[PDB]
Amino acid sequence: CGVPAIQPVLSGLSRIVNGEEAVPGSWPWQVSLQDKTGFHFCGGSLINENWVVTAAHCGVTTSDVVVAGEFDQGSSSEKIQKLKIAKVFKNSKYNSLTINNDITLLKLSTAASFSQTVSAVCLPSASDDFAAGTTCVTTGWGLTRYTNANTPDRLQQASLPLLSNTNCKKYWGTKIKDAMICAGASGVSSCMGDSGGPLVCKKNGAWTLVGIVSWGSSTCSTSTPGVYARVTALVNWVQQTLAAN
Template identity: 25%
Template sequence: MITILKIVLIITLTVYYVYAQYGPTKGCGQLLTDPAAVVTKNGWVAMVYRKDQTDVKKDPIDNKCLASIIKDNWLVGAASCFTLKDDQYMVKIPNNMTKGPFHVDKIYKSKEYNPTLGAGYDLALIKLKNGLQLKVNPKIISAICLSDYGFDSAINVNSNCSLDSCDTPGHLISEQIVTKDEGDCKKLYPKYKEGYMFCGNIPVHWLNSGAPVTCKDSNLQDKGPFFLSAMASWGRYPDDYKKVKDIDKADVYTKLYGKHYISWIQKTIEEDESHSLNL
């Protein structure tokens, strides 16, 4: 009996620790009741650029994709964005373009991600060489909350969420995105992996690859901030998208609530930081 109680206590403490580090705590994301109280809209969005290898003194040459700030020197993005070496990428923050660009130190891709075998597990962690100094001006730039380790977070079907993306290179916009039923996604996409993907009615294209989808937790109602629920991954070609019926308009987003991905993010960051301390 004592052993069982010890196990329960350990699990409980672990949940609270993870929740405190990665869950919807004070200081990340936008509160549902008062968005302006935490951070300017889109404050967690980062733009990933590819370096110009012909002249190291020049600014990055192109906006490759988007990512989301989750800690001072950590971002989460789409693995499919990163096809070059880690040090060939830089990051800029749209809400604070006077700073940076910030150099990428390492990119960790989900171990299951394999573009030759399918379109799932499209997730990457981006570590910056230097921190973003989030505490200096939290009204302009801030981390976005992750879900509470997958224990309780949920998004109801047909929930209205926000997609922070680009309509032109370097120009951020926010669009309302509606979540789709997983059964409908399975019918549209044979490679759809239930539990790891998230379908929405906004098309995914090169300007919004890796773009964050923020939703309110259906289980928290109006008590917490918007949290990072998914990010843009893949979908139909734009010309094909125009030909389908509205009911069939659903592109695929990597699902970021649920134990699988959140535990991978936590473990990867902790192992990297532990290794760095031991160097």
């Protein structure tokens, strides 16, 4: 888990504005959700070859499909895996107004073949403690929501820091709950992360999933932080589900 076959290269440009492109395959547990029509609509993480973490509010259903091993969303050459979901597990506690508890698992039909460019992230322990001020990374094709506005068909990356839930508050007041976690503000956007996209952190040589793109800056401001699923808080769940299925 969390030890890519292709170790990612992160420049400082990763630290400002709208981040920077990623080395292709640099982030393998990274997936995309496409609907029927095939609209890349959400982001996710392989925590295994049978399961996918994701943001609750992505309201994914078995109609959607998981895309894997992608890099540039505008490529047919891709040696990508398109996977079907068997069943879909939204955290029962998922609040829809606050968007607190924003998580949901995807247990696939067929199991995804891992690979160099295909694998999973590591999950924290509830116990884990990613101090505030930690440098993390968010990746995605969020900036692509810019249809006429854009950036890269290609996965971008960004390096932002962990926040105190308090300081975070200084930006979103109460929106911010105990199961959330914010990262950003450091003069670089976060809109590069799709929803359900990952916010991982290193430590002990591994990239561990720390949170999940919940929501952030209407305007992609570089002064506003991002909100994510406080994974630590959401992990037992995971585990539990993971067992019982």
